[PDB]
Amino acid sequence: PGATLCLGHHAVPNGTLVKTITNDQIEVTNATELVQSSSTGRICGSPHRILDGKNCTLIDALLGDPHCDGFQNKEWDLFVERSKAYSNCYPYDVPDYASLRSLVASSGTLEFINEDFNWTGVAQDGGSYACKRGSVNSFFSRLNWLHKLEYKYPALNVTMPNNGKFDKLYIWGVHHPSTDSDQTSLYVRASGRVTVSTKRSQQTVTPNIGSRPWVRGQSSRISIYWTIVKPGDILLINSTGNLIAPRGYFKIRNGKSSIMRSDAPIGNCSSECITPNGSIPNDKPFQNVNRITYGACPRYVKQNTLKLATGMRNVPE
Amino acid sequence: PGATLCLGHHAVPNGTLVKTITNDQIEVTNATELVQSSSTGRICGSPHRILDGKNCTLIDALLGDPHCDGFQNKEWDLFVERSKAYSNCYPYDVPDYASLRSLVASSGTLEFINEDFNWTGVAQDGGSYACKRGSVNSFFSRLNWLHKLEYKYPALNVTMPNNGKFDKLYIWGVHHPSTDSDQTSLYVRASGRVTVSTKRSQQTVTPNIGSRPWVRGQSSRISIYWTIVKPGDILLINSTGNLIAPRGYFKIRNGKSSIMRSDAPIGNCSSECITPNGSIPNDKPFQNVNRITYGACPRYVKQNTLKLATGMRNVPE
Amino acid sequence: PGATLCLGHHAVPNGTLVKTITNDQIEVTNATELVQSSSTGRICGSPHRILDGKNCTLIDALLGDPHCDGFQNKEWDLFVERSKAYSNCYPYDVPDYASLRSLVASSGTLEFINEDFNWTGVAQDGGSYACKRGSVNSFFSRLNWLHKLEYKYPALNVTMPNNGKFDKLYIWGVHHPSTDSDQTSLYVRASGRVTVSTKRSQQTVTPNIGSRPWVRGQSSRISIYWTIVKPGDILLINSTGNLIAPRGYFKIRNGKSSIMRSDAPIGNCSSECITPNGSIPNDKPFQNVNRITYGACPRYVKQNTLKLATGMRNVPE
Amino acid sequence: GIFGAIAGFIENGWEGMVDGWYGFRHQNSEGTGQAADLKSTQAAIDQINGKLNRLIEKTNEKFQQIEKEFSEVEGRIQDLEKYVEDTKIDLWSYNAELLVALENQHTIDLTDSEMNKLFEKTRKQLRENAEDMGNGCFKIYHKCDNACIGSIRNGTYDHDVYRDEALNNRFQI
Amino acid sequence: GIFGAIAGFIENGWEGMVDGWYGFRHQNSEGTGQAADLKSTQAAIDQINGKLNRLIEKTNEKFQQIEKEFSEVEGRIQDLEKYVEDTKIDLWSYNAELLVALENQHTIDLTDSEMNKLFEKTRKQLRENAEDMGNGCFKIYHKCDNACIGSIRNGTYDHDVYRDEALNNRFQI
Amino acid sequence: GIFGAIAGFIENGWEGMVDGWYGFRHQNSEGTGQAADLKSTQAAIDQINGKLNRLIEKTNEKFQQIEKEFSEVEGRIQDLEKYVEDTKIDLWSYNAELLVALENQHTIDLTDSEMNKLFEKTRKQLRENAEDMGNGCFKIYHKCDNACIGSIRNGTYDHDVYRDEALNNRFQI
Ligand SMILES: *[C@@H]1O[C@H](CO)[C@@H](O[C@@H]2O[C@H](CO)[C@@H](O[C@@H]3O[C@H](CO[C@H]4O[C@H](CO)[C@@H](O)[C@H](O)[C@@H]4O)[C@@H](O)[C@H](O[C@H]4O[C@H](CO)[C@@H](O)[C@H](O)[C@@H]4O)[C@@H]3O)[C@H](O)[C@H]2NC(C)=O)[C@H](O)[C@H]1NC(C)=O
Ligand SMILES: *[C@@H]1O[C@H](CO)[C@@H](O[C@@H]2O[C@H](CO)[C@@H](O[C@@H]3O[C@H](CO[C@H]4O[C@H](CO)[C@@H](O)[C@H](O)[C@@H]4O)[C@@H](O)[C@H](O[C@H]4O[C@H](CO)[C@@H](O)[C@H](O)[C@@H]4O)[C@@H]3O)[C@H](O)[C@H]2NC(C)=O)[C@H](O)[C@H]1NC(C)=O
Ligand SMILES: *[C@@H]1O[C@H](CO)[C@@H](O[C@@H]2O[C@H](CO)[C@@H](O[C@@H]3O[C@H](CO[C@H]4O[C@H](CO)[C@@H](O)[C@H](O)[C@@H]4O)[C@@H](O)[C@H](O[C@H]4O[C@H](CO)[C@@H](O)[C@H](O)[C@@H]4O)[C@@H]3O)[C@H](O)[C@H]2NC(C)=O)[C@H](O)[C@H]1NC(C)=O
Ligand SMILES: *[C@@H]1O[C@H](CO)[C@@H](O[C@@H]2O[C@H](CO)[C@@H](O)[C@H](O)[C@H]2NC(C)=O)[C@H](O)[C@H]1NC(C)=O
Ligand SMILES: *[C@@H]1O[C@H](CO)[C@@H](O[C@@H]2O[C@H](CO)[C@@H](O)[C@H](O)[C@H]2NC(C)=O)[C@H](O)[C@H]1NC(C)=O
Ligand SMILES: *[C@@H]1O[C@H](CO)[C@@H](O[C@@H]2O[C@H](CO)[C@@H](O)[C@H](O)[C@H]2NC(C)=O)[C@H](O)[C@H]1NC(C)=O
Ligand SMILES: *[C@@H]1O[C@H](CO)[C@@H](O[C@@H]2O[C@H](CO)[C@@H](O)[C@H](O)[C@H]2NC(C)=O)[C@H](O)[C@H]1NC(C)=O
Ligand SMILES: *[C@@H]1O[C@H](CO)[C@@H](O[C@@H]2O[C@H](CO)[C@@H](O)[C@H](O)[C@H]2NC(C)=O)[C@H](O)[C@H]1NC(C)=O
Ligand SMILES: *[C@@H]1O[C@H](CO)[C@@H](O[C@@H]2O[C@H](CO)[C@@H](O)[C@H](O)[C@H]2NC(C)=O)[C@H](O)[C@H]1NC(C)=O
Ligand SMILES: *[C@@H]1O[C@H](CO)[C@@H](O[C@@H]2O[C@H](CO)[C@@H](O)[C@H](O)[C@H]2NC(C)=O)[C@H](O)[C@H]1NC(C)=O
Ligand SMILES: *[C@@H]1O[C@H](CO)[C@@H](O[C@@H]2O[C@H](CO)[C@@H](O)[C@H](O)[C@H]2NC(C)=O)[C@H](O)[C@H]1NC(C)=O
Ligand SMILES: *[C@@H]1O[C@H](CO)[C@@H](O[C@@H]2O[C@H](CO)[C@@H](O)[C@H](O)[C@H]2NC(C)=O)[C@H](O)[C@H]1NC(C)=O
Ligand SMILES: *[C@@H]1O[C@H](CO)[C@@H](O)[C@H](O)[C@H]1NC(C)=O
Ligand SMILES: *[C@@H]1O[C@H](CO)[C@@H](O)[C@H](O)[C@H]1NC(C)=O
Ligand SMILES: *[C@@H]1O[C@H](CO)[C@@H](O)[C@H](O)[C@H]1NC(C)=O
Ligand SMILES: *[C@@H]1O[C@H](CO)[C@@H](O)[C@H](O)[C@H]1NC(C)=O
Ligand SMILES: *[C@@H]1O[C@H](CO)[C@@H](O)[C@H](O)[C@H]1NC(C)=O
Ligand SMILES: *[C@@H]1O[C@H](CO)[C@@H](O)[C@H](O)[C@H]1NC(C)=O
Ligand SMILES: *[C@@H]1O[C@H](CO)[C@@H](O)[C@H](O)[C@H]1NC(C)=O
Ligand SMILES: *[C@@H]1O[C@H](CO)[C@@H](O)[C@H](O)[C@H]1NC(C)=O
Ligand SMILES: *[C@@H]1O[C@H](CO)[C@@H](O)[C@H](O)[C@H]1NC(C)=O
């Protein structure tokens, strides 16, 4: 007689269905998930420098809203802005808010360098009960509210050379008084005009007297503008009234920094990839947690599962 | 002797050429076209709510140009704007026209809610022979042209709270008179100023007296502006003259609605995919009709034919 | 006994490593590089019409800065702007500079058509020592600086119909004088206003008197604006002072033209693909020289090498 | 091509085979005939129908996008609008070209594989009773009438019945 | 599928084979047994581990991008912001779907190929001493005890030792 | 790899084979020699030249795009300009990486297939006159001089001329 020798392959009782070019569902012995679909629900504080905005937006921290004073000169890899944040200073708006937030976020620092502007002829350090710092009526820490001195406000013509080797970010504003009385009680003339120039550019603003909706005790507003002065260029400031002056500049950087909207708590852990839902592992090539990410992240896709076969076809006995 | 058994495969006399990784053209027995390259040439009225703009742009229907009155409060999945459309009211321009058209188109409704503004002290319902409604000189149906009353125009300060739970879209304007005489004959002061505010934002406009090119009997213009007021916020209107006031708000929605430029006729048929050329089948994964589509559409590609082999290599006898 | 017949394949001693789905590095007998990673370092003057900007930006050539006079009416497929370029005329800024540069670059021509504007009542051909043409104080060649005539500047109302079949590009400006004295010594009234209209649109500008930083002898500026007038439409110009008038229009085209920033020299050679680093071959499907290209180019990728196997697995003896 | 059966060791196809994709032709003591093989034909058709369904899945319901035609020259924002869409169409055009190139390559290879599998299946049954002439045919070394051909086509061929007859015929002088 | 070994001429898999992916079952004069084949098992595992590593390479460190959620209605610029990202996610979703479809197709085909290579390797050793019964087994035409089975599994089988015995058994009457 | 011929049952390649990709080495009563096989060599080269041409087709004439370098910090619009291009380059980088990975996988598999097809073609001709030793060689069981080797290489080998001699030699004791 003799013998019989059979050749064969293994099988498992608990196979998994995968997709191919030909077949939406064919059973294989083993597979691995390629789509990340969970988060811890917390943002890990390592390895990125996470700065929790707390009650402060980035813009409120930049201007120096008093409850944001603790953010002065701070740095971040990722600024986390919280949805409970509140402004609590003079009512303001920022034309092209989104761009200012973006370029400050990208610089990754609120490092502020005080400069000695020559404001002889006007008073300084104006304040408001809408922007309390301790008990004293106050104002944005990084801004200098100029008003009249002995009942005159002379045409200011103030310059500042950039003799350094880096770009300077200047934040300044324009006051829109509620009434003509307040316009003249502050600035004498019935309408002012703020012009900020460099060798390459010019931004001129006119106040619009009139009541806006009531906000934190005030029907009046400030508008926030910004000007970047390159090395060798110069800032020149011209205003016949209503100028909300800079106190100096923010050092503008560029780096790997950004900003994210999230309510996830910051935790003592390490993860390269951050989403608004929390940090996620990046062992898989794709993820379904959020299209918003920061760091070394799996790429966002619509699928909630993609299984890669890691074994042969399963053919049960 | 015995027998011979031959194994073989079929062939056809009329094969088709397809592309592979290796070969731009190899003959197979059968193939199917994967690129849609035809349209019926008509837009099917099902299953999407198609609103034919006819002689009306969306913007003319929004403002309420008289020949567009029939579009009041109407809704759409797809607004079809026709190239023969004409404005026939007061000459106007809309700064960032494209954005207003986009956000109204995306809301998918012109549903308008009248509100009782307090305009005591000015006259209402100004009109023009350039905007005839029937025989009477008239104006945009959704806008209220305020002018002087007993030879005075008092500073208006008018508010409107949003006590609802939805966003309100307000459309308003600024009149630019042709001459100083008309400026003062309407508004008394030689130059007015329109300020529209919310708690978060402010848009202030100044008229520019002077003649524009002659259009429908007028050298003068109106400029269209818009303001969205969120729930719990408030619209406050301040103007010393030249205000083209809202009559109320449009309810802003978001949904699956859009707008399309097309001259294709609307027909009694069903197709998920609409292009400016007409509706197209979506049985194929790709299409070459138009990069502009709406609905469940094959993806637009540059190729005019892509053939998927559906049979083996063809090897003729 | 008999014979032995062995079947075999070739091998080489100097194989090359390639990537597969399975293996990052498997040795094959031969391969070819698919990523272009070198440039000659010069931009070939064929087959595209290369216009070397030399010391001139495109915008300086458009306005007609005197050292750019040689660029009048010239054409290009690719305008090459050099980093050493300098402005040397009246200090100016262009709001949305980037867009004007883009649309002029895309038209591919500076062809300028002089028109006979009716400027009776004002003087013409104002100039400045900051914009020397030869020895004479002068100005942008394509612009007409209007000032007062016998100590009056009457309200200008000047029109120009487009009776042609093509679009007209009009470049014009607004003068911002340094001082009130210069404002009135030029324009009589203390503040002017420039309005440029078509049937569809209106751009009105107000000068902002005041000193900007010192540039080429001047603390004053000009702002550049542009207006495109379609066939059958009309340009109407209204200004009570400070108008920097057009001398006519640029014919606007559309074609395959663009602009590129590069310091590479232009050479007597032929290459379909141009990058800022110089022309590159386009025999490979991908390239790593620069994401900025013009012409028939390999597609830009991050990889610096991608090797396509052109032979079998290499199995050394 | 990848298996050398179709467009290879099997000289060419059969235009008269219009009841299947694969099949049998025979010559024996009762004449000649032709019969389709249903399983290998269906196995190929099922795979091809599979790939057609996967391409006909995506919905790509898109509603409000960006404008893609412009009547005014605008500069920067329109350049970006135009560039984004151009970028999109070129990437999909690559995906479409490559998908078809991959699918078509796989279809020819997979239809070649069904051809080879039927040859090997038939070979294995015939055991020592037949030899491969190398042109897609077997020489069967015994009398094998139409019922006998049917048993090979049906997979019920009993090689042991014929082995003595066949071996005696194979190993002659 | 592409080779017809797995899910084909080999009826089905062995659930009791839990020390390898491929292997041997035998029946002989001393009984029956089962042994895994380590090289073909490792060859498949190495290829699969290879493809897993290539998918787990990319860093895709991205830091400052665009905003992707918006609390205000804005029109043109936001339509473009939304459209660009939607465009991006749909293209990656295609890449991910296709990658998995290609990888999975290749994994089944490549695991099928290891099965066939082991069959052919084993066939070639057995030379004229065995016949393929067509179901993934060889009939061995000589006495072949456990040490003998071990020599086939180990690749040390000397066919010349058994050829006379086997040929005499194959070519009977 | 997918066929186990190259980098598999054929121990290794021949560095002295510099007139072709595939070929023959023999040992017989007149000595030894080596000859390239032109058709299988050309068949592989034609397929590879085919894939090279498909990659060298696209024009991708692009003229006026967006700016991609910026000397000023601008915020929102530039973030979108930067993001769109970054999105574009990453998708093409994936396409390029995958294309090469797919092409290279297919090239090794397809060159392996040409190797196997030549082995099977040669096997089928030899019929019962040779046996496969499993290392890519045939033992030919008859006197087979250089003209005889030439007839196998040329495809004109007449197995019937040698079958009696070969069968008598194969089935000895
Ligand atoms: C143009 O028209 C607008 C709107 O009509 C006017 O704006 C109003 O101005 C008045 C006068 O200052 C404001 O009155 C103040 O309102 C504050 C906010 O009220 C909140 O609480 C009430 C509760 O009933 C809510 O209904 C309301 O919506 C708010 O949530 C009050 O807190 C103020 O009172 C406090 O301060 C004053 C001193 O400042 C004290 O005397 C009080 O005792 C109390 O401590 C005050 O009553 C009103 O809110 C404004 N409304 C809006 C919508 O802006 C403009 O003034 C008008 N312009 C001109 C030039 O006339
Ligand atoms: C600044 O400069 C501009 C341009 O020079 C002036 O604008 C012109 O103003 C006049 C005065 O109103 C306008 O005259 C009117 O033109 C209408 C349009 O004419 C059409 O038909 C003619 C046919 O020859 C075409 O050539 C032309 O292009 C138009 O297509 C006429 O229809 C008007 O006549 C009708 O109305 C009047 C009453 O309104 C009746 O008396 C007539 O009988 C008839 O029914 C009228 O003649 C002229 O069109 C304007 N042109 C432009 C380009 O705007 C500004 O007025 C000027 N500003 C100042 C302050 O002076
Ligand atoms: C508001 O405030 C600003 C800044 O404080 C004033 O702007 C200054 O105005 C003065 C007066 O015209 C300018 O003075 C001129 O400066 C030119 C540039 O100087 C260069 O070289 C010096 C070398 O020391 C550098 O330090 C400097 O940074 C520059 O690089 C000089 O070249 C001028 O002199 C030449 O021209 C004059 C005639 O025009 C001749 O008399 C000289 O001999 C020489 O040929 C001249 O001195 C000054 O540059 C301005 N600075 C800035 C930053 O703008 C505004 O004037 C002021 N506004 C009002 C209304 O007061
Ligand atoms: C709305 O704002 C305007 C400013 O544009 C205010 O205008 C003043 O109105 C008062 C009368 O109430 C006049 O005496 C002033 O001369 C106006 N000033 C200017 C600069 O024009 C107006 O007061 C505000 N509305 C209300 C109701 O107060
Ligand atoms: C991560 O967060 C996002 C958004 O915060 C979640 O997406 C939401 O999913 C719900 C349904 O579960 C929808 O109603 C919302 O509209 C989605 N939000 C958006 C912005 O589309 C997502 O599910 C979260 N993922 C995890 C794992 O928690
Ligand atoms: C199914 O396959 C997975 C992945 O191929 C295997 O688990 C891996 O095991 C390797 C070692 O072989 C380890 O490096 C990892 O811990 C595992 N990786 C992953 C992604 O899971 C294993 O062969 C099978 N797993 C199970 C649970 O059956
Ligand atoms: C162009 O528009 C201006 C407005 O900026 C008009 O200016 C008026 O001109 C007349 C003389 O024609 C003066 O009496 C008025 O005082 C000016 N008004 C203002 C507000 O400055 C000018 O009239 C228009 N052009 C023409 C030709 O009429
Ligand atoms: C669908 O419409 C588009 C545009 O309306 C057509 O594309 C045009 O094709 C012609 C040549 O046949 C070109 O001259 C135009 O420039 C194209 N238009 C654009 C905007 O590029 C397209 O051919 C139409 N398709 C069908 C099937 O009718
Ligand atoms: C060529 O192939 C097509 C598609 O593979 C076949 O026609 C299909 O037939 C199926 C049933 O087998 C039906 O569901 C459809 O009506 C057809 N679909 C398509 C896309 O055509 C058929 O095998 C061949 N057609 C022709 C005309 O030869
Ligand atoms: C800054 O620019 C303003 C213009 O907004 C200049 O304002 C003039 O100032 C002088 C006094 O220096 C007054 O006599 C004029 O009446 C003002 N003109 C206007 C139109 O308001 C101001 O002069 C400039 N600054 C300096 C220091 O000169
Ligand atoms: C082509 O030019 C680009 C930019 O001019 C070169 O990219 C630079 O590479 C250096 C390192 O070698 C970096 O420090 C720069 O930051 C890069 N520039 C940018 C804009 O990223 C590129 O290397 C050049 N290629 C060749 C072949 O010369
Ligand atoms: C390696 O392969 C390359 C490309 O496959 C070959 O060189 C090509 O030779 C063809 C003719 O066979 C010519 O058209 C070209 O000049 C070459 N093209 C390229 C892209 O190099 C050749 O087989 C091998 N080259 C070397 C140097 O070994
Ligand atoms: C099968 O069950 C085992 C035992 O629990 C488990 O480890 C394995 O992951 C399962 N495999 C699949 C594909 O479900
Ligand atoms: C934020 O404000 C609220 C109320 O004052 C409080 O929960 C919390 O103390 C504040 N956060 C910080 C960081 O002070
Ligand atoms: C071949 O001709 C038949 C008969 O008209 C037709 O049905 C079939 O579609 C044709 N096939 C090809 C590939 O042209
Ligand atoms: C559009 O206007 C023209 C001219 O009045 C006419 O063809 C048609 O009746 C109008 N359309 C509608 C819907 O009234
Ligand atoms: C191997 O060396 C030859 C001889 O110089 C050369 O032509 C060939 O390109 C080399 N091949 C590889 C893959 O390095
Ligand atoms: C550019 O200016 C510099 C200095 O005048 C000089 O190198 C060169 O001659 C100028 N270029 C041209 C084209 O005149
Ligand atoms: C083979 O099967 C077919 C259909 O199942 C049947 O018609 C035929 O008679 C069978 N032939 C034999 C020889 O079993
Ligand atoms: C085969 O090899 C294994 C391990 O290398 C060994 O345990 C076994 O004894 C060997 N058997 C024979 C028959 O050589
Ligand atoms: C085989 O063919 C080659 C070339 O076609 C020829 O040189 C050689 O003599 C032939 N040999 C035989 C044995 O036919």
From TrEMBL, chains A, B, C:
Palmitoylated. In natural infection, inactive HA is matured into HA1 and HA2 outside the cell by one or more trypsin-like, arginine-specific endoprotease secreted by the bronchial epithelial cells. One identified protease that may be involved in this process is secreted in lungs by club cells. Keywords: Clathrin- and caveolin-independent endocytosis of virus by host, Clathrin-mediated endocytosis of virus by host, Coiled coil, Disulfide bond, Fusion of virus membrane with host endosomal membrane, Fusion of virus membrane with host membrane, Glycoprotein, Hemagglutinin, Host cell membrane, Host membrane, Host-virus interaction, Lipoprotein, Membrane, Palmitate, Signal, Transmembrane, Transmembrane helix, Viral attachment to host cell, Viral envelope protein, Viral penetration into host cytoplasm, Virion, Virus endocytosis by host, Virus entry into host cell. Disulfide bonds join C56-C68, C273-C297. It is a single-pass type I membrane protein. GO terms for biological process: clathrin-dependent endocytosis of virus by host cell; fusion of virus membrane with host endosome membrane; fusion of virus membrane with host plasma membrane; viral budding from plasma membrane; virion attachment to host cell. The keyword Metal-binding does not apply. GO terms for molecular function: host cell surface receptor binding. GO terms for cellular component: host cell plasma membrane; membrane; viral envelope; virion membrane. The keyword Lipoprotein applies. Its main location: host cell. It is found in: Host apical cell membrane; Virion membrane. Homotrimer of disulfide-linked HA1-HA2. Belongs to the influenza viruses hemagglutinin family. Binds to sialic acid-containing receptors on the cell surface, bringing about the attachment of the virus particle to the cell. This attachment induces virion internalization either through clathrin-dependent endocytosis or through clathrin- and caveolin-independent pathway. Plays a major role in the determination of host range restriction and virulence. Class I viral fusion protein. Responsible for penetration of the virus into the cell cytoplasm by mediating the fusion of the membrane of the endocytosed virus particle with the endosomal membrane. Binds to sialic acid-containing receptors on the cell surface, bringing about the attachment of the virus particle to the cell. This attachment induces virion internalization of about two third of the virus particles through clathrin-dependent endocytosis and about one third through a clathrin- and caveolin-independent pathway. Plays a major role in the determination of host range restriction and virulence. Class I viral fusion protein. This is Hemagglutinin. It comes from Influenza A virus (A/Shandong/9/1993(H3N2)). The gene is HA.
